[PDB]
């Protein structure tokens, strides 16, 4: 899609093995790639990959991001944890790894942790300090939006 | 949360787990503590023991028994201290240094002194990195104890365990 | 609500050594040079509370047999007065006494002076020995009355109207030149080095930035026999602020600032070097090539930045020296040791002597005449048993370092440019370097002092002339013999 | 108490009505810092005075036994603000900032002590923190009364009364709640007024949320109490203190962040600007040395250095570095310490040490006892670090810095700690040479002690001279004459900044972005380009030593050129490598090779005459005997004595 | 000299008096004893450090890098493939 958050939640690089033999290698001189090969690759073209095969052509192997290590971390304090250090993507990203290996389990958990973050943004939404350097992008985002929106209304709020 | 280096620590993180991450200098040496009184008295026989809390026991604050030995608890029975069967944890403490590389500036470093009990002891040379766990205690009075004041430096902390 | 009298001169006049029982509780006067002193700590005096007894006062000084509310302090100051080195009967050691300041009379004193006290002597309490004694012996404190300066010099109105008059003739300067080292007979070069760097020089700071430098630093390089010590020794009777640190060793000060533990048992004192102590005022030092590399490189910054930075213990500031060094340095081995250049004649390092403007160098052996001239000098000084009289000279100098800030006009000093030209280009076929850019603006600077001198409030021709005949023959009689070749065109510029 | 009832009363009501037309200012100065979890509300006393004289009229007379009864007054504010009902709450710090009348620190003499000070001073060090109390549980040794004292500041002592005695109370660490404090030491200021004096300086306890708040060596300006302790060191002497509330940093001097791995925006907006131009890397060479004339290879050098390059992370563990080195070696008038000065202040992090380094601080990583004391090679990690006297240092950590430089890591044994941490730095070091321009008639290498190796090591050596020329040295002494009055040459750069030229306070952003952003890579063409480069060097100046000629050629050196490749790629910032990139490149380091390729009297060689006719058995001589000859002979130095020794050692005499 | 041939210490210091083991084997790397004259300089008086070293050192390998033309060549070429 046109916005710039999306096409660039789609050039992170995710730990994917091939199911099957490729010769016609496009990335070197192979020429084909031997079975079980773990090769990084960029969301947009691992993304139908694991659909169109019926075995589909990767294996999709979870994220070291995705770690249960790090689903576990982010149950403790979300507040305090620093989502800008690990992808910096989450929530742009997690959305579309949750839907594509459709993983219940987890929604729960992050459905979770951005309420937690929240009820926080609404806390520096009043008028940083070094919390603003820890968010996600995209979250960051929200906080120019509302940061904004409480500014211009105070700025109204008198002459 | 608590996640914190040492640099970064007290008071809002205190008498609460810690984990510490930094190196380790200069390794205090190694020593004997105290902790279980065992005795026989004879000829009215019988098995007599006393149990020492020092300041570090359990967790806990707890009223001072040191020190010496009990030495004829009542009546007035002979007791001879029983060596071996009375219980002794090594005791040890080493002080934590924030990370050279992350340091902020020509800034001076800020330590924090780690207590290791039992089997801690001696599993770490001096100039290793760390990361020790603990609950972070405040022991000593300030000098609010006495009646001199002194000055207004107080409650030396370390990290118990862990 | 109280003003505690001073009472002036009160002999008495007892020697400090002299003193005895017979002077307990009665006001007796002392003198003698001060030692460090301890800093300022409120002393308690009166009590006093909101109620919940009523004032106690306590003490001079006891305290038996505390609340507070508001309680009026009085600064507090000890300071050790010891006996005056000059005045020492021979063989016997300077015995010293405790000292007693109080309100007004803190910091009015301070170490390496002369103080005159009227403060009454006092005992207690013992005090505390009974250990190391055998007996029941109190110390002796003198609680202090006044200060005073030894027993001070400043210009005045008659003096200086009648002042102006004098410095209107030309060559006053040469007087002052004279004037400057009587005793030595010494030479009309080296002396006149001398008079230019204690005389001044404009500081003199760039908006916003960069203040060049305002001082001029004389190297005495000496010679055995010569006399390269006693000169400068003339500086530290004269100048305003004048410090000998002597090379090392020390003859205190020792000229490095270091936070040191303090005498008996004391809290920690910050210390300058020379440099520090010295400021606004003329350093002096003598043999370098005997200091310690410790001292060099604290020189050194100095020199450079015009301000000495320390960073221990907890303390970490800039304290600011920006004194003008003078100093004797004695070269490697004999009188004149090579034929080779002076960065060769001597050890210092080359980096260290380019910091030094103007270079003063003695040669190189006797004569009829000039053994003549001295013999009759040297005489003279023993039988004993033009210039200007040396007090107006020694008051000169403050005037016009206070007073006037003398400045070039950019019209027809453009010369001076020229001048570097015909000197750069011309010198680089013989020797190395030396010359540079810096030793450009040591001739407007130079120049400049003597415009002090003259009392000018500008820069003029003769000013230029006399400065450019100093930097000019300094970096001549630098170079190798080679430089006699160099002669022949000093012509133009002599 | 009805009348502390009655003072906070006053200050509820000049908390909740107070008025700067029409909001209020402190009601939401609170809400706006419990938010963010500050726990602090900081009073203008312009205000206070305003809104009522007489409060002020007593906190000015007794502000140890009132400023408590504010704070316990606004955090019963924070009560009904920040929470409602029908925990746990600190109680709020304080800090009030105010002009008045500035007190130096010289006329601070008892009189105004217990009445608040404001004043002026650079700090010195700051002592680490330690934790007071505030709110702590005792118990009773027997018994057992559990107390709960509430600790205010406004030392204490603790109450005897529930045999019992005559102080059995317990402190319960469990339940305590604990506070921070500080402790700043301030010199007052160099200008104002030291006089003859060393300036004194008056210890500091900050406490709760300023602390950390100044890093030491930043002029301030303190408000607080001014009050006296105790501390035996008689009689009764009691020693002074400045207890902090609040303060507050002059507006320039380090604030912070001044260091942030991101800087703003409208900065890549002229950066990427600044990348589009072609003189780009020419107008670069230009900022460099306002001051110093000529030197162009010297001037691009820096350059290159500053940029950084190449680095590989690459397995196995071994992970080549960036960047090069650089010597500026040669007799003075070359201003390499002048030049190196002005590196030290462009460069991001950089830390100026000639030696044997100074004062006190040892050449870069330190060994000191309570652990690494940060150094040089240490406090100035990841970037570029400037030595002196290169020649001139000591052994023991010469043997450091030699291992140092190639693989970025330095181990120390030293005692109780063995650590092996890491220096990223770049050294840039100038040499001072022996004896002048002979030897450049001597042998290139050959310098530095006895050995090359130095030379070896690093990438890129530049012989200079102060040169002389009437066309440049009339150019550098007019240029002077204009410097020193009317004095307005200084302009030029400034006219170069309104068209073209960097403010080198730019500069230096500019290089911590293209540091951190974009790590360049080589091309293909470019890397056969430098094959081609390394083997016509290696093949003709081996034909150059089939005569033994004195002199070099590692395979380090081609990585030298190559990691200039990459720190110039770094330059255009673009992620890739080009030909002329690196022609330009193959050029400059020749210039450094012809740096690498540039009779004696032998009078003090003359040691035949000693060692013949003078002695058979060499004994009772030996280096001893050759001075005293040569002592009071007005003749022999260190490295004379030795390369005439050496030099008959070889020669075969 | 103690340490490698005999393959003993022995320590008479003050002091604890004993003769204790130490047969470690040994490698070292020197530089060319002043003077790059490593490689065409004599079989002696290139080593520098006489001379029961020189034996007691089982073997001593000389590394004079000097072409040897045919052979810069292609240690260059090997650098270049390795560099990647």
């Given at each position: 899609?046109?916005?710039?958050?999306?096409?660039?939640?789609?050039?992170?690089?995710?730990?994917?093995?091939?199911?099957?033999?490729?010769?016609?290698?496009?990335?070197?001189?192979?020429?084909?790639?031997?079975?079980?090969?773990?090769?990084?690759?960029?969301?947009?073209?691992?993304?139908?990959?694991?659909?169109?095969?019926?075995?589909?052509?990767?294996?999709?192997?979870?994220?070291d991001m995705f770690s249960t290590k790090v689903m576990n971390a982010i149950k403790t304090d979300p507040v305090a944890l620093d989502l800008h250090s690990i992808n910096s993507?989450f929530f742009?990203?997690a959305?579309?790894?949750?839907?594509?290996?459709?993983?219940?389990e987890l929604?729960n958990v992050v459905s979770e942790l951005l309420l937690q973050r929240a009820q926080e943004l609404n806390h520096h939404a009043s008028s940083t300090s070094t919390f603003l350097l820890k968010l996600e992008?995209?979250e960051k985002?929200?906080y120019?939006?509302?940061?904004?929106?409480?500014?211009?209304?105070?700025?109204?709020?008198?002459? | 949360a608590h996640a914190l280096s040492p640099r970064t620590l007290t008071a809002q993180h205190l008498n609460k787990l810690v984990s510490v991450e930094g190196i380790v200098t200069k390794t205090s040496l190694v020593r004997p503590k105290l902790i279980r009184?065992?005795?026989?008295?004879?000829?009215?026989?019988?098995?007599?023991?006393?149990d020492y809390t020092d300041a570090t026991t359990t967790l806990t604050t707890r009223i001072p028994t040191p020190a010496?030995?009990?030495?004829?608890?009542?009546?007035?029975?002979?007791?001879?201290?029983?060596?071996?069967?009375?219980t002794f944890i090594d005791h040890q403490r080493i002080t934590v240094q924030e990370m050279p590389e992350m340091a902020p500036a020509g800034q001076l470093p800020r330590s924090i002194d780690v207590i290791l009990d039992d089997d801690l002891v001696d599993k770490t040379k001096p100039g290793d990195r760390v990361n020790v766990v603990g609950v972070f205690k405040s022991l000593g009075a300030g000098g609010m104890n006495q009646?001199?004041s002194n000055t207004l430096i107080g409650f030396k902390t370390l990290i118990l365990g862990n | 609500?109280?003003?505690?009298?001073?009472?002036?001169?009160?002999?008495?006049?007892?020697?400090?050594?002299?003193?005895?029982?017979?002077?307990?509780?009665?006001?007796?006067?002392?003198?003698?040079?001060?030692?460090?002193?301890?800093?300022?700590?409120?002393?308690?005096?009166?009590?006093?509370?909101?109620?919940?007894?009523?004032?106690?006062?306590?003490?001079?000084?006891?305290?038996?047999?505390?609340?507070?509310?508001?309680?009026?302090?009085?600064?507090?100051?000890?300071?050790?007065?010891?006996?005056?080195?000059?005045?020492?009967?021979?063989?016997?050691?300077?015995?010293?006494?405790?000292?007693?300041?109080?309100?007004?009379?803190?910091?009015?004193?301070?170490?390496?002076?002369?103080?005159?006290?009227?403060?009454?002597?006092?005992?207690?309490?013992?005090?505390?020995?009974?250990?190391?004694?055998?007996?029941?012996?109190?110390?002796?404190?003198?609680?202090?009355?006044?200060?005073?300066?030894?027993?001070?010099?400043?210009?005045?109105?008659?003096?200086?109207?009648?002042?102006?008059?004098?410095?209107?003739?030309?060559?006053?300067?040469?007087?002052?030149?004279?004037?400057?080292?009587?005793?030595?007979?010494?030479?009309?070069?080296?002396?006149?080095?001398?008079?230019?760097?204690?005389?001044?020089?404009?500081?003199?700071?760039?908006?916003?930035?960069?203040?060049?430098?305002?001082?001029?630093?004389?190297?005495?390089?000496?010679?055995?026999?010569?006399?390269?010590?006693?000169?400068?020794?003339?500086?530290?009777?004269?100048?305003?602020?004048?410090?000998?640190?002597?090379?090392?060793?020390?003859?205190?000060?020792?000229?490095?600032?270091?936070?040191?533990?303090?005498?008996?048992?004391?809290?920690?004192?910050?210390?300058?070097?020379?440099?520090?102590?010295?400021?606004?005022?003329?350093?002096?030092?003598?043999?370098?090539?005997?200091?310690?590399?410790?001292?060099?490189?604290?020189?050194?910054?100095?020199?450079?930045?015009?301000?000495?930075?320390?960073?221990?213990?907890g303390?970490?500031?800039?304290?600011?020296?920006?004194?003008?060094?003078?100093?004797?340095?004695?070269?490697?081995?004999?009188?004149?040791?090579?034929?080779?250049?002076?960065?060769?004649?001597?050890?210092?390092?080359?980096?260290?002597?380019?910091?030094?403007?103007?270079?003063?160098?003695?040669?190189?052996?006797?004569?009829?005449?000039?053994?003549?001239?001295?013999?009759?000098?040297?005489?003279?000084?023993?039988?004993?048993?033009?210039?200007?009289?040396?007090?107006?000279?020694?008051?000169?100098?403050?005037?016009?370092?206070?007073?006037?800030?003398?400045?070039?006009?950019?019209?027809?000093?453009?010369?001076?440019?020229?001048?570097?030209?015909?000197?750069?280009?011309?010198?680089?076929?013989?020797?190395?370097?030396?010359?540079?850019?810096?030793?450009?603006?040591?001739?407007?600077?130079?120049?400049?002092?003597?415009?002090?001198?003259?009392?000018?409030?500008?820069?003029?021709?003769?000013?230029?002339?006399?400065?450019?005949?100093?930097?000019?023959?300094?970096?001549?009689?630098?170079?190798?013999?080679?430089?006699?070749?160099?002669?022949?065109?000093?012509?133009?510029?002599? | 108490?009805?009348?502390?009832?009655?003072?906070?009363?006053?200050?509820?009501?000049?908390?909740?009505?107070?008025?700067?037309?029409?909001?209020?200012?402190?009601?939401?100065q609170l809400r706006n810092n419990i938010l963010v979890k500050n726990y602090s509300l900081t009073?203008?006393?312009?205000?206070?005075?305003?809104?009522?004289?007489?409060?002020?009229?007593?906190?000015?007379?007794?502000?140890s036994?009132?400023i408590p009864l504010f704070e316990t007054a606004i955090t019963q504010v924070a009560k009904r603000i920040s929470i409602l009902s029908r925990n746990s709450l600190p109680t709020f710090q304080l800090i009030?900032?105010?002009?008045?009348?500035?007190?130096?620190?010289?006329?601070?003499?008892?009189?105004?002590?217990?009445?608040?000070?404001?004043?002026?001073?650079?700090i010195?060090s700051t002592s680490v923190l330690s934790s007071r109390a505030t709110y702590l549980s005792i118990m009773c040794r027997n018994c057992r009364h559990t107390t709960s004292i509430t600790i205010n500041n406004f030392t204490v002592s603790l109450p005897?009364?529930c045999?019992?005695?005559?102080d059995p109370y317990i402190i319960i660490h469990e339940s305590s709640k604990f506070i921070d404090q500080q402790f700043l030491k301030?010199?007052?200021?160099?200008?104002?007024?030291?006089?003859?004096?060393?300036?004194?300086?008056?210890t500091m306890t900050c406490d709760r949320y300023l602390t950390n708040k100044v890093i030491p060596?930043?002029?301030?300006?303190?408000?607080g109490?001014?009050?006296?302790y105790?501390?035996?060191?008689?009689?009764?002497?009691?020693?002074?203190y400045?207890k902090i509330l609040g303060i507050?940093s002059?507006?320039?001097?380090?604030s912070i962040w001044?260091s942030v791995t991101?800087?703003?925006?409208?900065?890549?907006?002229?950066?990427?600007?600044?990348?589009?131009?072609?003189?780009?890397?020419?107008?670069?060479?230009?900022?460099?040395?306002?001051?110093?004339?000529?030197?162009?290879?010297?001037?691009?050098?820096?350059?290159?250095?500053?940029?950084?390059?190449?680095?590989?992370?690459?397995?196995?563990?071994?992970?080549?570095?960036?960047?090069?080195?650089?010597?500026?070696?040669?007799?003075?008038?070359?201003?390499?310490?002048?030049?190196?000065?002005?590196?030290?202040?462009?460069?991001?992090?950089?830390?100026?040490?000639?030696?044997?380094?100074?004062?006190?601080?040892?050449?870069?990583?330190?060994?000191?006892r309570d652990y690494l004391e940060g150094?040089?090679?240490?406090?100035?990690?990841?970037?570029?670090?400037?030595?002196?006297?290169?020649?001139?240092?000591?052994?023991?950590?010469?043997?450091?810095?030699?291992?140092?430089?190639?693989?970025?890591?330095?181990?120390?044994?030293?005692?109780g700690i063995?650590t092996?941490l890491?220096?990223?730095?770049?050294?840039?070091?100038?040499?001072?040479?022996?004896?002048?321009?002979?030897?450049?008639?001597?042998?290139?290498?050959?310098?530095?002690?006895?050995?090359?190796?130095?030379?070896?090591?690093?990438?890129?050596?530049?012989?200079?001279?102060?040169?002389?020329?009437?066309?440049?040295?009339?150019?550098?002494?007019?240029?002077?004459?204009?410097?020193?009055?009317?004095?307005?040459?200084?302009?030029?750069?400034?006219?170069?900044?309104?068209?073209?030229?960097?403010?080198?306070?730019?500069?230096?952003?500019?290089?911590?972005?293209?540091?951190?952003?974009?790590?360049?890579?080589?091309?293909?063409?470019?890397?056969?380009?430098?094959?081609?480069?390394?083997?016509?060097?290696?093949?003709?100046?081996?034909?150059?030593?089939?005569?033994?000629?004195?002199?070099?050629?590692?395979?380090?050196?081609?990585?030298?050129?190559?990691?200039?490749?990459?720190?110039?790629?770094?330059?255009?910032?673009?992620?890739?490598?080009?030909?002329?990139?690196?022609?330009?490149?193959?050029?400059?380091?020749?210039?450094?090779?012809?740096?690498?390729?540039?009779?004696?009297?032998?009078?003090?060689?003359?040691?035949?005459?000693?060692?013949?006719?003078?002695?058979?058995?060499?004994?009772?001589?030996?280096?001893?005997?050759?001075?005293?000859?040569?002592?009071?002979?007005?003749?022999?130095?260190?490295?004379?004595?030795?390369?005439?020794?050496?030099?008959?050692?070889?020669?075969?005499? | 000299?103690?340490?490698?041939?005999?393959?003993?210490?022995?320590?008479?210091?003050?002091?604890?008096?004993?003769?204790?083991?130490?047969?470690?084997?040994?490698?070292?790397?020197?530089?060319?004893?002043?003077?790059?004259?490593?490689?065409?300089?004599?079989?002696?008086?290139?080593?520098?450090?006489?001379?029961?070293?020189?034996?007691?050192?089982?073997?001593?390998?000389?590394?004079?890098?000097?072409?040897?033309?045919?052979?810069?060549?292609?240690?260059?070429?090997?650098?270049?493939?390795?560099?990647?």
């Open positions: 899609y046109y916005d710039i958050d999306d096409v660039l939640a789609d050039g992170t690089e995710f730990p994917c093995k091939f199911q099957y033999d490729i010769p016609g290698l496009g990335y070197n001189p192979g020429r084909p790639i031997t079975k079980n090969t773990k090769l990084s690759l960029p969301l947009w073209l691992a993304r139908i990959l694991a659909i169109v095969g019926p075995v589909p052509f990767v294996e999709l192997l979870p994220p993507h742009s990203l959305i579309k790894w949750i839907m594509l290996f459709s993983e219940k929604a992008e995209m985002e929200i120019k939006k509302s940061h904004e929106s409480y500014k211009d209304t105070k700025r109204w709020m008198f002459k | 009184s065992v005795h026989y008295a004879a000829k009215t026989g019988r098995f007599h023991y006393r010496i030995y009990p030495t004829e608890d009542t009546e007035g029975n002979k007791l001879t201290t029983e060596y071996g069967y009375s009646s001199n | 609500s109280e003003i505690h009298v001073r009472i002036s001169d009160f002999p008495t006049i007892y020697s400090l050594r002299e003193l005895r029982e017979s002077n307990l509780s009665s006001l007796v006067r002392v003198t003698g040079v001060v030692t460090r002193r301890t800093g300022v700590f409120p002393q308690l005096k009166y009590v006093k509370f909101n109620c919940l007894l009523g004032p106690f006062f306590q003490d001079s000084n006891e305290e038996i047999r505390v609340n507070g509310e508001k309680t009026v302090y009085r600064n507090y100051q000890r300071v050790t007065l010891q006996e005056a080195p000059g005045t020492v009967p021979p063989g016997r050691l300077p015995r010293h006494r405790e000292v007693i300041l109080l309100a007004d009379l803190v910091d009015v004193s301070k170490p390496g002076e002369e103080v005159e006290v009227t403060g009454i002597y006092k005992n207690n309490y013992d005090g505390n020995l009974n250990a190391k004694n055998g007996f029941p012996v109190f110390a002796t404190i003198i609680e202090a009355n006044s200060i005073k300066r030894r027993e001070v010099f400043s210009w005045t109105e008659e003096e200086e109207r009648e002042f102006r008059k004098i410095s209107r003739d030309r060559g006053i300067i040469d007087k002052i030149i004279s004037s400057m080292a009587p005793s030595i007979y010494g030479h009309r070069d080296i002396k006149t080095a001398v008079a230019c760097s204690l005389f001044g020089g404009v500081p003199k700071n760039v908006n916003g930035k960069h203040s060049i430098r305002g001082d001029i630093n004389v190297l005495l390089l000496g010679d055995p026999g010569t006399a390269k010590s006693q000169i400068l020794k003339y500086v530290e009777k004269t100048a305003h602020r004048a410090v000998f640190a002597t090379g090392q060793g020390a003859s205190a000060v020792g000229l490095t600032a270091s936070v040191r533990k303090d005498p008996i048992t004391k809290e920690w004192t910050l210390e300058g070097g020379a440099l520090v102590l010295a400021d606004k005022g003329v350093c002096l030092i003598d043999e370098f090539d005997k200091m310690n590399d410790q001292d060099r490189t604290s020189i050194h910054e100095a020199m450079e930045q015009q301000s000495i930075s320390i960073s221990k213990a303390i970490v500031t800039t304290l600011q020296a920006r004194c003008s060094i003078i100093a004797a340095a004695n070269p490697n081995g004999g009188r004149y040791n090579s034929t080779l250049p002076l960065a060769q004649n001597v050890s210092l390092t080359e980096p260290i002597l380019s910091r030094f403007d103007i270079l003063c160098v003695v040669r190189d052996l006797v004569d009829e005449e000039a053994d003549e001239r001295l013999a009759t000098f040297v005489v003279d000084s023993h039988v004993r048993s033009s210039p200007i009289p040396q007090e107006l000279l020694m008051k000169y100098i403050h005037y016009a370092r206070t007073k006037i800030y003398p400045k070039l006009h950019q019209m027809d000093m453009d010369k001076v440019s020229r001048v570097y030209a015909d000197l750069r280009r011309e010198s680089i076929s013989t020797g190395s370097f030396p010359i540079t850019v810096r030793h450009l603006e040591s001739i407007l600077r130079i120049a400049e002092s003597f415009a002090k001198m003259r009392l000018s409030e500008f820069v003029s021709s003769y000013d230029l002339d006399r400065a450019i005949k100093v930097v000019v023959d300094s970096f001549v009689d630098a170079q190798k013999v080679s430089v006699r070749r160099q002669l022949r065109r000093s012509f133009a510029i002599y | 108490d009805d009348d502390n009832t009655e003072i906070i009363k006053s200050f509820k009501n000049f908390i909740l009505e107070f008025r700067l037309d029409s909001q209020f200012i402190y009601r939401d009073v203008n006393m312009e205000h206070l005075i305003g809104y009522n004289e007489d409060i002020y009229k007593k906190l000015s007379d007794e502000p036994d009132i009030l900032n105010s002009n008045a009348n500035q007190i130096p620190l010289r006329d601070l003499d008892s009189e105004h002590v217990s009445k608040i000070v404001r004043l002026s001073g650079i010195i005897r009364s045999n019992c005695g005559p301030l010199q007052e200021i160099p200008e104002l007024v030291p006089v003859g004096e060393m300036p004194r300086n008056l060596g930043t002029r301030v300006t303190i408000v109490i001014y009050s006296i105790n501390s035996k060191n008689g009689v009764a002497i009691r020693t002074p400045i507050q002059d507006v320039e001097t380090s001044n991101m800087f703003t925006e409208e900065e890549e907006e002229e950066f990427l600007q600044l990348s589009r131009n072609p003189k780009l890397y020419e107008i670069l060479t230009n900022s460099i040395a306002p001051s110093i004339f000529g030197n162009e290879d010297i001037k691009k050098a820096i350059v290159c250095l500053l940029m950084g390059g190449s680095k590989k992370i690459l397995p196995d563990g071994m992970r080549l570095r960036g960047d090069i080195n650089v010597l500026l070696l040669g007799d003075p008038g070359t201003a390499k310490s002048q030049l190196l000065k002005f590196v030290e202040k462009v460069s991001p992090i950089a830390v100026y040490t000639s030696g044997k380094g100074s004062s006190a601080a040892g050449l870069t990583a330190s060994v000191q150094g040089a090679m240490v406090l100035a990690d990841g970037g570029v670090v400037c030595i002196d006297e290169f020649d001139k240092m000591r052994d023991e950590d010469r043997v450091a810095i030699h291992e140092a430089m190639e693989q970025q890591t330095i181990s120390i044994a030293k005692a063995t092996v890491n220096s990223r730095t770049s050294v840039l070091a100038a040499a001072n040479p022996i004896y002048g321009r002979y030897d450049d008639l001597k042998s290139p290498g050959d310098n530095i002690d006895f050995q090359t190796t130095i030379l070896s090591r690093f990438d890129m050596i530049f012989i200079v001279k102060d040169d002389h020329n009437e066309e440049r040295d009339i150019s550098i002494a007019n240029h002077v004459i204009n410097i020193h009055t009317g004095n307005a040459n200084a302009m030029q750069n400034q006219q170069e900044e309104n068209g073209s030229e960097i403010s080198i306070e730019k500069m230096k952003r500019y290089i911590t972005y293209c540091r951190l952003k974009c790590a360049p890579r080589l091309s293909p063409q470019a890397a056969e380009k430098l094959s081609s480069n390394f083997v016509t060097i290696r093949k003709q100046l081996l034909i150059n030593e089939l005569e033994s000629t004195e002199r070099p050629i590692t395979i380090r050196q081609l990585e030298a050129i190559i990691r200039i490749t990459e720190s110039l790629a770094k330059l255009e910032l673009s992620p890739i490598a080009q030909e002329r990139h690196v022609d330009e490149a193959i050029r400059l380091f020749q210039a450094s090779t012809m740096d690498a390729a540039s009779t004696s009297l032998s009078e003090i060689r003359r040691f035949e005459q000693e060692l013949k006719r003078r002695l058979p058995i060499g004994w009772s001589t030996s280096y001893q005997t050759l001075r005293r000859e040569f002592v009071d002979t007005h003749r022999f130095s260190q490295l004379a004595l030795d390369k005439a020794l050496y030099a008959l050692e070889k020669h075969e005499t | 000299h103690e340490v490698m041939e005999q393959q003993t210490v022995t320590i008479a210091k003050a002091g604890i008096h004993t003769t204790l083991n130490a047969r470690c084997s040994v490698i070292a790397a020197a530089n060319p004893v002043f003077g790059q004259y490593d490689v065409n300089r004599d079989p002696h008086q290139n080593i520098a450090l006489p001379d029961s070293l020189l034996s007691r050192f089982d073997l001593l390998f000389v590394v004079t890098d000097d072409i040897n033309e045919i052979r810069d060549r292609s240690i260059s070429e090997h650098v270049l493939r390795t560099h990647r």
